[PDB]
Amino acid sequence: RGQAADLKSTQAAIDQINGILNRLIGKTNEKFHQIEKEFSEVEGRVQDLEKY
Amino acid sequence: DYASLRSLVASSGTLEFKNESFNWTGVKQNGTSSACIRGSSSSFFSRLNWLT
Numbered sequence: 001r002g003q004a005a006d007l008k009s010t011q012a013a014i015d016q017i018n019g020i021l022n023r024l025i026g027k028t029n030e031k032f033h034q035i036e037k038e039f040s041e042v043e044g045r046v047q048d049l050e051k052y
Numbered sequence: 053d054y055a056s057l058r059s060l061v062a063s064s065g066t067l068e069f070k071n072e073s074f075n076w077t078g079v080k081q082n083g084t085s086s087a088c089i090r091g092s093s094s095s096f097f098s099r100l101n102w103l104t
């Protein structure tokens with residue numbers, strides 16, 4: 001009795017998963033100056049629009 | 053700025069009023085207009101004081 005592994009199919013699956021991961025992980029956009037997202041007072045409709 | 057006050061009061065969710073005793077020396081308080089008729093006599097806004 002014996003057991004063994006197949007390398008070609010294993011490598012194909014690993015390569016596809018690694019391609020997906022490389023397409024997802026590490027790609028990030030840069031945003032520098034944006035609007036205020038926390039407020040200490042209430043002032044009306046402009047702050048409401050920003051929150052919305 | 054009507055919209056800001058409307059939004060602020062709507063978000064507050066109450067009309068609770070506590071009466072304070074301002075000094076208001078040397079003037080005539082209350083004051084009534086013919087446009088606001090409460091019952092049969094002239095009146096004014098209930099929560100605002102017209103100083104004359």
Ligand SMILES: *[C@@H]1O[C@H](CO)[C@@H](O)[C@H](O)[C@H]1NC(C)=O
Nearest residue numbers: 072073074075076077078079
């Ligand atoms: C209101 O004004 C009068 C003016 O004579 C003063 O004597 C009194 O202390 C004042 N009251 C308050 C509560 O500030």
Ligand SMILES: *[C@@H]1O[C@H](CO)[C@@H](O)[C@H](O)[C@H]1NC(C)=O
Nearest residue numbers: 076079080081082083101102
């Ligand atoms: C104004 O009217 C109110 C309600 O009747 C009363 O409490 C207050 O003393 C009046 N102020 C005056 C007469 O100066």
